[PDB]
């Protein structure tokens, strides 16, 4: 729901964001502090979804 948004943690994984980016299933796609195509070289930990 709106006031009870689900929260999940992503860690210890390998993620191919290319298949998510080229996918047209997502109507709108805005990445703020990182370039959309620059997610395949740098990476992080404790991803919050």
């Amino acid at each position: 729901s709106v006031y009870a948004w689900n929260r999940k943690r992503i860690s210890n994984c390998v993620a191919d964001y290319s298949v998510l980016y080229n996918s047209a299933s997502f109507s709108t796609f805005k990445c703020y502090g990182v370039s959309p195509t620059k997610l395949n070289d740098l990476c992080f930990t404790n991803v919050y979804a």
């Binding site: 502090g33 990182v34 370039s35 195509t37 620059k38 070289d41 740098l42």
Partner: protein
Amino acid sequence: STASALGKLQDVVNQNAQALNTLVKQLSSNFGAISSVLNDILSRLDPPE
């Protein structure tokens, strides 16, 4: 025996060293940008922004 009898030369050397040291230390300032490192900020945002 007596020390600190050559204060002027030591002061000149200290002034030069301190000026160089603060010039070197100035590189760690964001200056209003996202980060103070060129390589990492280059690999995060598209060249348009």
